[PDB]
Amino acid sequence: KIEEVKSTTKTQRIASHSHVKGLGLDESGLAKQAASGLVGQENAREACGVIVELIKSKKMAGRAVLLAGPPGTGKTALALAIAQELGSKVPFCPMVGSEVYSTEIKKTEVLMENFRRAIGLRIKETKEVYEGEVTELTPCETENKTISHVIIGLKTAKGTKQLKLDPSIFESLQKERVEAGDVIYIEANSGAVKRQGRCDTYATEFDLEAEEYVPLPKGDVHKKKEIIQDVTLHDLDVANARPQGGQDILSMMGQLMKPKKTEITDKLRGEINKVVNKYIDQGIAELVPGVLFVDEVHMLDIECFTYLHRALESSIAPIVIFASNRGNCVIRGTEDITSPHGIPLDLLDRVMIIRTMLYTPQEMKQIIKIRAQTEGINISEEALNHLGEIGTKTTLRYSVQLLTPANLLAKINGKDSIEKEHVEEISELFYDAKSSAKILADQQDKY
Amino acid sequence: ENQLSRLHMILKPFMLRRIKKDVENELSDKIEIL
Numbered sequence: 078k079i080e081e082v083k084s085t086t087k088t089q090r091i092a093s094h095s096h097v098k099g100l101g102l103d104e105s106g107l108a109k110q111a112a113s114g115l116v117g118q119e120n121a122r123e124a125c126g127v128i129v130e131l132i133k134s135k136k137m138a139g140r141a142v143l144l145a146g147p148p149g150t151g152k153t154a155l156a157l158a159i160a161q162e163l164g165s166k167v168p169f170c171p172m173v174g175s176e177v178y179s180t181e182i183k184k185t186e187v188l189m190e191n192f193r194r195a196i197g198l199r200i201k202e203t204k205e206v207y208e209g210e211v212t213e214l215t216p217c218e219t220e221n222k223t224i225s226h227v228i229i230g231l232k233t234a235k236g237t238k239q240l241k242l243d244p245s246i247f248e249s250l251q252k253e254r255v256e257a258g259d260v261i262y263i264e265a266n267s268g269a270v271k272r273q274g275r276c277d278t279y280a281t282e283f284d285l286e287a288e289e290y291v292p293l294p295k296g297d298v299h300k301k302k303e304i305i306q307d308v309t310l311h312d313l314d315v316a317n318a319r320p321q322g323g324q325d326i327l328s329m330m331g332q333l334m335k336p337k338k339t340e341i342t343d344k345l346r347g348e349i350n351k352v353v354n355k356y357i358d359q360g361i362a363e364l365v366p367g368v369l370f371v372d373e374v375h376m377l378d379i380e381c382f383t384y385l386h387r388a389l390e391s392s393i394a395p396i397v398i399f400a401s402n403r404g405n406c407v408i409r410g411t412e413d414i415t416s417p418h419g420i421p422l423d424l425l426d427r428v429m430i431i432r433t434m435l436y437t438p439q440e441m442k443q444i445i446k447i448r449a450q451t452e453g454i455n456i457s458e459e460a461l462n463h464l465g466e467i468g469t470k471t472t473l474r475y476s477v478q479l480l481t482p483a484n485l486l487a488k489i490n491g492k493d494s495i496e497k498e499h500v501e502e503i504s505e506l507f508y509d510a511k512s513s514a515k516i517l518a519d520q521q522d523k524y
Numbered sequence: 525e526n527q528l529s530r531l532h533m534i535l536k537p538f539m540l541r542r543i544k545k546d547v548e549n550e551l552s553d554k555i556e557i558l
């Protein structure tokens with residue numbers, strides 16, 4: 078008789094690049110005219126094609142490319158297209174040029190955090206663990222007396238064992254306030270203890286208690302498992318520099334204090350490199366060297382640019398992508414010196430430059446269409462042509478930005494779609510950079 | 525029709541049938557949902 082269903086969970090939010098799904102190549106490496114949500118830019122998309130081959134080759138260290146071209150030309154969108162084309166597995170580290178100016182560590186070292194974060198590593202961590210209901214807890218003592226050894230009895234649905242354990246595990250059980258009848262998990266590699274709560278066998282022993290009870294664990298008490306960890310080299314560099322691991326008073330204390338950054342010594346990266354080369358030679362690991370993308374690179378300091386010379390040459394370093402949108406600009410921190418793209422010529426020799434074209438009106442229409450069917454809105458043909466008309470006079474971003482304001486006006490007067498009168502009305506409310514600069518230059522006596 | 529009518533007359537001398545109306549004078553329907 079009846080049919081029933083439900084769904085009310087909100088979507089992910091729509092965003093200024095969420096229509097980008099890939100580079101839209103064919104198998105020859107040519108760009109399709111419009112595919113994967115992109116249009117145009119073939120002379121750049123083919124080049125980005127060679128760079129996604131370059132990442133997936135793993136062979137190179139410190140190769141770098143610069144996406145250059147006017148505002149609104151899609152340089153960030155193409156860098157996102159590279160990120161989508163690599164999929165989830167390979168790390169892509171986004172960065173903005175003004176992020177180097179930390180107040181906690183030198184600019185020159187904030188770049189090394191990102192360089193070490195853009196190299197990914199995969200590990201088969203063969204952990205082993207004890208878990209169960211604690212049926213017994215009995216410490217053992219030694220000469221001047223103090224604790225020396227521990228008995229813990231554990232029980233699970235598949236058996237029970239009377240374990241013999243290190244007195245640091247007793248100190249750790251005491252810290253977690255573990256008692257008989259508690260269900261606990263112990264990571265034997267790490268001394269770590271997690272108290273889940275009392276076993277459900279005791280679930281009504283009081284009318285009130287603060288606990289939430291848990292079911293008795295399944296399988297044997299003592300067992301090992303092949304956990305697969307995805308981690309960056311930076312996550313090895315930092316965890317050794319201010320360790321929260323282990324069970325002692327010093328690590329337990331150092332976890333609570335303010336987590337200031339610190340200027341990591343090269344010798345520690347030397348140890349991490351020696352360690353991970355052993356994990357690769359044992360066949361435990363896989364390395365996944367990925368991408369560092371520095372958007373707005375043109376306001377790195379000449380300190381940073383002169384450090385990038387040494388970084389991009391390092392046989393460790395990840396592949397790099399830069400973006401810039403500047404002409405013959407003065408390089409920040411130099412005051413005297415003007416160069417292409419806001420980048421010193423000394424660095425500009427070290428990058429393969431990808432040149433980004435401006436759009437024709439007939440490409441504006443096609444981006445705007447693809448954008449409207451991403452915003453989730455319907456538009457009539459003369460209305461879409463009027464956004465293209467505006468796009469010839471103004472800029473690509475402005476013609477996109479008029480869409481949803483017009484869609485609100487459309488449904489505020491009950492229509493299903495944007496009509497030209499809704500775009501034409503919206504253009505009277507929301508000025509652009511060009512038209513505002515006119516009225517602001519006319520009225521300049523009053524501002 | 526024809527083959528089923530013969531298969532029915534094989535079964536009917538040794539199988540009974542009713543439809544639930546002998547008790548749905550007293551009982552209401554299943555409310556059935558997909």
Ligand SMILES: Nc1ncnc2c1ncn2[C@@H]1O[C@H](COP(=O)(O)OP(=O)(O)O)[C@@H](O)[C@H]1O
Binds near residue numbers: 148153
């Ligand atoms: N070739 C393209 N294909 C798809 N979307 C594009 C393309 N070029 C630009 N866009 C879109 O238009 C806007 C401007 O591009 P963007 O990457 O932000 O420019 P910029 O490099 O100057 O910062 C964004 O919404 C972007 O996703």
